């Protein structure tokens, strides 16, 4: 089904993110996708356009000496093809350590991601790390 194909695409995307494989990661996102990062840090906001998403992703890895990881724990689906990834983000940056849980809500258009929205459990921890 559609919903499981979208789940497969999410799994492929976490793997490609974690390995820095931005060529695969491209295939999986619509060129007009958005990415929504909550909170009050310098990397918060609505990043509109796949190019703006991948700049965000580049800051995630860039600013942590490539230590930033998304450890995927569970993948959930709606019958209509929405997908959530539950994960933990870990990373190091200037003597600080990140370890926070997150649910990303993925919306799809024609099998590609059109929207991703991060929901961190301890948003304060994320913001503290990025301060």
């Amino acid at each position: 089904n559609e919903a499981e194909q979208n789940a497969e695409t999410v799994r492929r995307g976490y793997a490609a993110f974690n390995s820095g494989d931005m060529k695969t990661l491209t295939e999986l996102f619509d060129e007009n996708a958005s990415w929504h990062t909550p909170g009050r840090s310098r990397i918060a906001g609505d990043h509109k356009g796949r190019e703006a998403i991948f700049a965000q992703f580049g800051r995630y890895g860039g600013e942590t000496g490539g230590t930033f990881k998304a450890v995927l724990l569970h993948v959930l689906k709606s019958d209509d093809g929405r997908v959530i990834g539950i994960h933990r983000n870990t990373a190091e940056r200037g003597g600080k350590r990140l370890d926070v849980g997150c649910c990303i809500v993925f919306e799809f258009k024609n099998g590609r991601v059109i929207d991703g929205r991060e929901h961190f459990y301890d948003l304060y921890a994320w913001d503290e790390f990025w301060r």
Copy 2:
């Protein structure tokens, strides 16, 4: 399937929460369920035990003159019976208004909720409302 029965139970629980039907809401939670509220407000924390959950719920409604609502938007499932509810919470309290998005991760034991974990997008807004 198990996963869809658990989805049905989540839907029944949002409806029973929104109507104040704590008798139904009881049937749906294990007596040793936990509820996890993130953030730094006076209502944050790990509320362990169904009685502690329902005290939390009682504060949600109690402290907002019964205006607190969870508007359910989407229900997602893992093949293994985990469920997420995506919702918006709205409420009023002493001239402040709540309007925040949330994903709750539900874990099940024998068809009843054993664990619920709130993930607010704008956790600062939630904490501000409860200040």
